[PDB]
Design a protein. Structure first.
Lengths: 149, 149
Protein backbone atom coordinates (compact mmCIF):
# COMPACT_ATOMS: atom_id res chain seq x y z
CA UNK A 1 0.00 0.00 0.00
CA UNK A 2 2.70 2.63 0.81
CA UNK A 3 4.43 2.17 -2.60
CA UNK A 4 1.37 2.06 -4.90
CA UNK A 5 0.81 4.85 -7.39
CA UNK A 6 -1.69 5.46 -10.23
CA UNK A 7 -0.98 7.42 -13.41
CA UNK A 8 -3.78 9.67 -14.69
CA UNK A 9 -3.72 11.68 -17.92
CA UNK A 10 -6.12 14.64 -18.34
CA UNK A 11 -6.51 17.44 -20.96
CA UNK A 12 -7.00 21.21 -20.82
CA UNK A 13 -6.37 24.02 -23.34
CA UNK A 14 -5.32 21.45 -25.97
CA UNK A 15 -2.47 20.37 -23.67
CA UNK A 16 -1.86 17.22 -21.68
CA UNK A 17 -1.59 17.10 -17.86
CA UNK A 18 0.07 13.95 -16.52
CA UNK A 19 -0.66 13.14 -12.86
CA UNK A 20 0.66 10.48 -10.47
CA UNK A 21 -1.60 9.79 -7.44
CA UNK A 22 -0.35 8.01 -4.31
CA UNK A 23 -3.38 5.75 -3.95
CA UNK A 24 -3.45 5.41 -0.14
CA UNK A 25 -3.16 9.19 0.59
CA UNK A 26 -4.50 11.11 -2.45
CA UNK A 27 -1.12 12.97 -2.71
CA UNK A 28 -0.12 13.98 -6.28
CA UNK A 29 2.68 15.14 -8.56
CA UNK A 30 1.80 16.51 -12.01
CA UNK A 31 3.35 18.02 -15.16
CA UNK A 32 2.17 19.65 -18.37
CA UNK A 33 3.42 17.88 -21.57
CA UNK A 34 2.76 18.62 -25.30
CA UNK A 35 1.54 15.03 -25.85
CA UNK A 36 1.46 11.76 -23.91
CA UNK A 37 4.27 9.69 -25.46
CA UNK A 38 6.13 6.70 -23.94
CA UNK A 39 9.20 8.92 -23.57
CA UNK A 40 7.37 11.68 -21.63
CA UNK A 41 5.73 9.07 -19.37
CA UNK A 42 9.04 7.25 -18.88
CA UNK A 43 10.85 10.47 -17.83
CA UNK A 44 7.99 11.47 -15.50
CA UNK A 45 8.15 8.03 -13.76
CA UNK A 46 11.92 8.34 -13.27
CA UNK A 47 11.44 11.76 -11.63
CA UNK A 48 8.67 10.44 -9.37
CA UNK A 49 10.59 7.34 -8.20
CA UNK A 50 13.72 9.37 -7.32
CA UNK A 51 11.45 11.52 -5.09
CA UNK A 52 9.16 8.95 -3.32
CA UNK A 53 9.37 5.13 -2.74
CA UNK A 54 7.50 3.95 -5.86
CA UNK A 55 7.04 0.14 -5.76
CA UNK A 56 4.12 -0.34 -8.13
CA UNK A 57 2.58 1.86 -10.81
CA UNK A 58 -0.87 1.31 -12.24
CA UNK A 59 -0.25 2.71 -15.69
CA UNK A 60 -3.01 4.90 -17.21
CA UNK A 61 -3.40 3.06 -20.55
CA UNK A 62 -2.13 0.16 -22.62
CA UNK A 63 0.14 2.24 -24.86
CA UNK A 64 2.25 3.32 -21.89
CA UNK A 65 2.03 -0.17 -20.44
CA UNK A 66 3.40 -1.54 -23.77
CA UNK A 67 5.96 1.22 -24.45
CA UNK A 68 9.58 -0.07 -24.46
CA UNK A 69 10.76 3.29 -23.04
CA UNK A 70 8.25 3.13 -20.14
CA UNK A 71 9.32 -0.51 -19.49
CA UNK A 72 12.98 0.63 -19.58
CA UNK A 73 12.28 3.43 -17.04
CA UNK A 74 10.38 1.01 -14.78
CA UNK A 75 13.20 -1.54 -14.97
CA UNK A 76 15.77 1.19 -14.18
CA UNK A 77 13.87 2.60 -11.20
CA UNK A 78 12.76 -0.77 -9.68
CA UNK A 79 9.07 -0.24 -10.37
CA UNK A 80 6.53 -3.02 -10.98
CA UNK A 81 4.35 -1.99 -13.87
CA UNK A 82 0.75 -3.06 -13.47
CA UNK A 83 -2.39 -2.36 -15.45
CA UNK A 84 -4.67 0.43 -14.18
CA UNK A 85 -7.91 -1.53 -14.62
CA UNK A 86 -10.38 -0.60 -11.82
CA UNK A 87 -11.26 -4.02 -10.37
CA UNK A 88 -12.83 -1.95 -7.62
CA UNK A 89 -15.12 0.18 -9.85
CA UNK A 90 -15.14 3.26 -7.54
CA UNK A 91 -11.54 3.87 -8.75
CA UNK A 92 -12.56 5.57 -12.04
CA UNK A 93 -14.92 7.97 -10.22
CA UNK A 94 -12.28 8.99 -7.68
CA UNK A 95 -9.93 9.76 -10.62
CA UNK A 96 -12.62 11.62 -12.67
CA UNK A 97 -13.52 13.67 -9.54
CA UNK A 98 -9.88 14.64 -8.99
CA UNK A 99 -9.45 15.70 -12.62
CA UNK A 100 -12.50 17.98 -12.17
CA UNK A 101 -11.09 19.39 -8.87
CA UNK A 102 -7.69 20.01 -10.48
CA UNK A 103 -9.22 21.82 -13.47
CA UNK A 104 -11.30 23.99 -11.12
CA UNK A 105 -8.23 25.05 -9.09
CA UNK A 106 -6.41 25.70 -12.36
CA UNK A 107 -9.34 27.96 -13.36
CA UNK A 108 -9.27 29.72 -9.93
CA UNK A 109 -5.55 30.70 -10.36
CA UNK A 110 -5.89 31.98 -13.93
CA UNK A 111 -5.32 35.58 -12.99
CA UNK A 112 -2.12 34.75 -11.05
CA UNK A 113 -0.30 32.51 -13.55
CA UNK A 114 0.63 33.50 -17.10
CA UNK A 115 1.55 29.95 -18.17
CA UNK A 116 -0.53 26.78 -17.82
CA UNK A 117 2.43 24.89 -16.34
CA UNK A 118 2.58 27.44 -13.46
CA UNK A 119 -1.17 27.08 -12.81
CA UNK A 120 -0.87 23.24 -12.74
CA UNK A 121 1.88 23.48 -10.12
CA UNK A 122 -0.23 25.87 -8.04
CA UNK A 123 -3.07 23.28 -8.25
CA UNK A 124 -0.65 20.54 -7.10
CA UNK A 125 0.27 22.76 -4.13
CA UNK A 126 -3.34 23.53 -3.19
CA UNK A 127 -4.44 19.86 -3.58
CA UNK A 128 -1.57 18.49 -1.39
CA UNK A 129 -1.97 21.11 1.37
CA UNK A 130 -5.86 21.05 1.54
CA UNK A 131 -7.19 19.93 4.91
CA UNK A 132 -9.77 17.15 4.59
CA UNK A 133 -8.46 17.02 9.34
CA UNK A 134 -5.23 15.88 7.66
CA UNK A 135 -3.80 16.94 4.29
CA UNK A 136 -2.73 14.49 1.52
CA UNK A 137 0.86 15.63 2.20
CA UNK A 138 0.56 14.68 5.88
CA UNK A 139 -1.04 11.32 5.02
CA UNK A 140 1.72 10.20 2.59
CA UNK A 141 4.47 11.09 5.06
CA UNK A 142 2.68 9.18 7.93
CA UNK A 143 1.97 6.13 5.69
CA UNK A 144 5.60 5.87 4.60
CA UNK A 145 7.01 6.64 8.08
CA UNK A 146 4.84 3.86 9.57
CA UNK A 147 6.22 1.61 6.78
CA UNK A 148 9.93 2.44 7.46
CA UNK A 149 9.55 1.69 11.20
CA UNK B 1 14.55 22.38 10.93
CA UNK B 2 12.10 20.02 9.14
CA UNK B 3 11.03 22.89 6.78
CA UNK B 4 14.51 24.23 5.90
CA UNK B 5 15.85 23.89 2.35
CA UNK B 6 18.97 25.20 0.55
CA UNK B 7 19.21 26.06 -3.15
CA UNK B 8 22.38 25.06 -5.04
CA UNK B 9 23.21 25.80 -8.64
CA UNK B 10 25.95 23.75 -10.29
CA UNK B 11 27.23 23.47 -13.90
CA UNK B 12 27.96 20.63 -16.35
CA UNK B 13 28.31 20.34 -20.15
CA UNK B 14 27.59 24.08 -20.54
CA UNK B 15 24.21 23.55 -18.82
CA UNK B 16 22.77 24.54 -15.46
CA UNK B 17 21.67 22.08 -12.76
CA UNK B 18 19.48 23.56 -10.03
CA UNK B 19 19.36 21.57 -6.73
CA UNK B 20 17.26 21.99 -3.56
CA UNK B 21 18.65 20.17 -0.51
CA UNK B 22 16.61 19.40 2.61
CA UNK B 23 19.26 20.51 5.10
CA UNK B 24 18.36 18.12 7.98
CA UNK B 25 18.30 15.00 5.77
CA UNK B 26 20.48 15.49 2.63
CA UNK B 27 17.43 14.64 0.42
CA UNK B 28 17.35 16.49 -2.93
CA UNK B 29 15.22 17.48 -5.90
CA UNK B 30 17.04 18.74 -9.06
CA UNK B 31 16.39 19.95 -12.63
CA UNK B 32 18.36 20.90 -15.73
CA UNK B 33 17.62 24.46 -16.98
CA UNK B 34 19.15 26.44 -19.91
CA UNK B 35 20.11 29.36 -17.62
CA UNK B 36 19.54 30.29 -13.98
CA UNK B 37 16.99 33.10 -14.26
CA UNK B 38 14.55 34.44 -11.62
CA UNK B 39 11.66 32.84 -13.54
CA UNK B 40 13.28 29.36 -13.63
CA UNK B 41 14.17 29.58 -9.92
CA UNK B 42 10.63 30.87 -9.09
CA UNK B 43 8.98 27.96 -10.97
CA UNK B 44 11.34 25.37 -9.39
CA UNK B 45 10.45 26.67 -5.87
CA UNK B 46 6.74 26.45 -6.64
CA UNK B 47 7.11 22.80 -7.72
CA UNK B 48 9.21 21.99 -4.63
CA UNK B 49 6.77 23.56 -2.12
CA UNK B 50 3.71 21.76 -3.55
CA UNK B 51 5.60 18.45 -3.01
CA UNK B 52 7.19 18.89 0.50
CA UNK B 53 6.48 21.32 3.41
CA UNK B 54 8.92 24.16 2.56
CA UNK B 55 9.03 26.78 5.37
CA UNK B 56 12.36 28.46 4.67
CA UNK B 57 14.65 28.60 1.65
CA UNK B 58 18.26 29.64 1.80
CA UNK B 59 18.56 31.05 -1.68
CA UNK B 60 21.78 30.26 -3.58
CA UNK B 61 22.81 33.83 -4.59
CA UNK B 62 21.75 37.46 -4.28
CA UNK B 63 20.22 37.68 -7.77
CA UNK B 64 17.56 35.09 -6.91
CA UNK B 65 17.15 36.60 -3.45
CA UNK B 66 16.49 39.97 -5.17
CA UNK B 67 14.38 38.78 -8.13
CA UNK B 68 10.75 39.97 -8.11
CA UNK B 69 9.60 36.68 -9.65
CA UNK B 70 11.38 34.63 -6.96
CA UNK B 71 9.84 36.88 -4.26
CA UNK B 72 6.39 36.44 -5.89
CA UNK B 73 6.75 32.59 -5.91
CA UNK B 74 7.91 32.64 -2.28
CA UNK B 75 4.97 34.83 -1.27
CA UNK B 76 2.55 32.56 -3.21
CA UNK B 77 3.86 29.34 -1.69
CA UNK B 78 4.19 30.63 1.90
CA UNK B 79 7.98 30.41 1.90
CA UNK B 80 10.35 32.62 3.93
CA UNK B 81 13.32 33.65 1.80
CA UNK B 82 16.59 33.77 3.69
CA UNK B 83 20.12 34.34 2.47
CA UNK B 84 22.32 31.25 1.99
CA UNK B 85 25.45 32.64 3.66
CA UNK B 86 27.46 29.87 5.41
CA UNK B 87 27.50 31.53 8.87
CA UNK B 88 28.37 27.96 9.73
CA UNK B 89 31.30 27.49 7.24
CA UNK B 90 31.08 23.66 7.01
CA UNK B 91 27.80 24.23 5.09
CA UNK B 92 29.66 25.30 1.93
CA UNK B 93 32.05 22.29 1.84
CA UNK B 94 29.08 19.95 2.26
CA UNK B 95 27.52 21.61 -0.83
CA UNK B 96 30.72 21.36 -2.94
CA UNK B 97 31.05 17.67 -1.97
CA UNK B 98 27.44 17.01 -3.04
CA UNK B 99 27.98 18.73 -6.38
CA UNK B 100 31.01 16.50 -6.98
CA UNK B 101 29.12 13.33 -5.96
CA UNK B 102 26.23 14.32 -8.28
CA UNK B 103 28.48 14.91 -11.31
CA UNK B 104 30.21 11.60 -10.60
CA UNK B 105 26.88 9.71 -10.60
CA UNK B 106 25.90 11.60 -13.77
CA UNK B 107 29.17 10.37 -15.38
CA UNK B 108 28.44 6.76 -14.34
CA UNK B 109 25.02 6.75 -16.09
CA UNK B 110 26.03 8.00 -19.54
CA UNK B 111 25.84 4.58 -21.27
CA UNK B 112 22.18 4.57 -20.12
CA UNK B 113 20.84 8.09 -20.60
CA UNK B 114 20.81 9.88 -23.96
CA UNK B 115 19.89 13.30 -22.50
CA UNK B 116 21.52 15.12 -19.60
CA UNK B 117 18.10 15.76 -17.97
CA UNK B 118 17.56 11.98 -17.69
CA UNK B 119 21.04 11.40 -16.22
CA UNK B 120 20.33 14.15 -13.64
CA UNK B 121 17.09 12.45 -12.54
CA UNK B 122 18.95 9.13 -12.28
CA UNK B 123 21.50 10.88 -10.00
CA UNK B 124 18.65 12.27 -7.81
CA UNK B 125 17.25 8.71 -7.53
CA UNK B 126 20.63 7.16 -6.63
CA UNK B 127 21.44 9.99 -4.11
CA UNK B 128 18.05 9.74 -2.31
CA UNK B 129 18.08 5.90 -2.16
CA UNK B 130 21.77 5.54 -1.16
CA UNK B 131 22.10 3.81 2.19
CA UNK B 132 24.60 5.79 4.31
CA UNK B 133 22.30 3.22 8.05
CA UNK B 134 19.27 4.99 6.56
CA UNK B 135 18.79 6.73 3.20
CA UNK B 136 18.16 10.49 2.68
CA UNK B 137 14.59 9.61 1.55
CA UNK B 138 14.05 7.72 4.80
CA UNK B 139 15.50 10.56 6.89
CA UNK B 140 13.26 13.28 5.38
CA UNK B 141 10.04 11.25 5.87
CA UNK B 142 11.01 10.43 9.50
CA UNK B 143 11.96 14.10 10.22
CA UNK B 144 8.62 15.40 8.85
CA UNK B 145 6.55 12.59 10.44
CA UNK B 146 8.01 13.47 13.85
CA UNK B 147 7.10 17.12 13.14
CA UNK B 148 3.46 16.22 12.32
CA UNK B 149 3.46 14.00 15.47
C1 LIG C 1 4.98 33.65 -9.29
N1 LIG C 1 4.63 34.01 -10.64
C2 LIG C 1 4.21 32.93 -11.50
C3 LIG C 1 5.30 32.49 -12.42
C4 LIG C 1 6.57 32.28 -11.89
C5 LIG C 1 7.63 31.87 -12.65
C6 LIG C 1 7.38 31.67 -13.99
C7 LIG C 1 6.15 31.87 -14.53
C8 LIG C 1 5.07 32.29 -13.77
C9 LIG C 1 3.72 32.50 -14.37
O1 LIG C 1 3.04 33.47 -13.94
O2 LIG C 1 3.36 31.68 -15.24
O3 LIG C 1 6.15 31.61 -15.89
C10 LIG C 1 7.43 30.96 -16.01
O4 LIG C 1 8.31 31.26 -14.90
C11 LIG C 1 4.72 35.32 -11.09
O5 LIG C 1 5.41 36.18 -10.57
N2 LIG C 1 3.95 35.61 -12.20
C12 LIG C 1 4.35 36.73 -13.03
C13 LIG C 1 3.18 37.60 -13.36
O6 LIG C 1 3.37 38.67 -13.91
N3 LIG C 1 1.95 37.10 -13.00
C14 LIG C 1 0.75 37.87 -13.22
C15 LIG C 1 0.19 37.64 -14.59
C16 LIG C 1 -1.00 36.96 -14.74
C17 LIG C 1 -1.54 36.73 -15.99
C18 LIG C 1 -0.88 37.20 -17.10
C19 LIG C 1 0.30 37.88 -16.97
C20 LIG C 1 0.83 38.10 -15.71
C21 LIG C 1 5.16 36.34 -14.22
C22 LIG C 1 6.53 36.33 -14.11
C23 LIG C 1 7.31 35.98 -15.19
C24 LIG C 1 6.72 35.64 -16.38
C25 LIG C 1 5.35 35.65 -16.49
C26 LIG C 1 4.57 36.01 -15.41
C1 LIG D 1 14.83 4.84 -19.67
N1 LIG D 1 15.51 5.51 -20.75
C2 LIG D 1 16.01 6.83 -20.48
C3 LIG D 1 15.12 7.87 -21.09
C4 LIG D 1 13.76 7.74 -20.89
C5 LIG D 1 12.84 8.63 -21.40
C6 LIG D 1 13.34 9.67 -22.12
C7 LIG D 1 14.69 9.82 -22.34
C8 LIG D 1 15.62 8.93 -21.83
C9 LIG D 1 17.08 9.11 -22.07
O1 LIG D 1 17.77 8.08 -22.29
O2 LIG D 1 17.53 10.29 -22.02
O3 LIG D 1 14.95 10.95 -23.09
C10 LIG D 1 13.61 11.46 -23.28
O4 LIG D 1 12.58 10.65 -22.70
C11 LIG D 1 15.63 4.93 -22.01
O5 LIG D 1 14.98 3.95 -22.38
N2 LIG D 1 16.55 5.54 -22.84
C12 LIG D 1 16.49 5.31 -24.26
C13 LIG D 1 17.83 4.82 -24.73
O6 LIG D 1 17.95 4.35 -25.85
N3 LIG D 1 18.86 4.95 -23.83
C14 LIG D 1 20.14 4.33 -24.11
C15 LIG D 1 21.09 5.28 -24.76
C16 LIG D 1 22.24 5.66 -24.10
C17 LIG D 1 23.12 6.54 -24.69
C18 LIG D 1 22.86 7.03 -25.94
C19 LIG D 1 21.72 6.66 -26.61
C20 LIG D 1 20.83 5.78 -26.02
C21 LIG D 1 15.97 6.47 -25.03
C22 LIG D 1 14.62 6.56 -25.27
C23 LIG D 1 14.10 7.62 -25.99
C24 LIG D 1 14.93 8.61 -26.46
C25 LIG D 1 16.29 8.52 -26.22
C26 LIG D 1 16.80 7.46 -25.51
Amino acid sequence: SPGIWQLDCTHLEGKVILVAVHVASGYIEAEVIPAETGQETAYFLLKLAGRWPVKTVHTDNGSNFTSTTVKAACWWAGIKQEDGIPYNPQSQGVIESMNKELKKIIGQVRDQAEHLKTAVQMAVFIHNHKRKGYSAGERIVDIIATDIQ
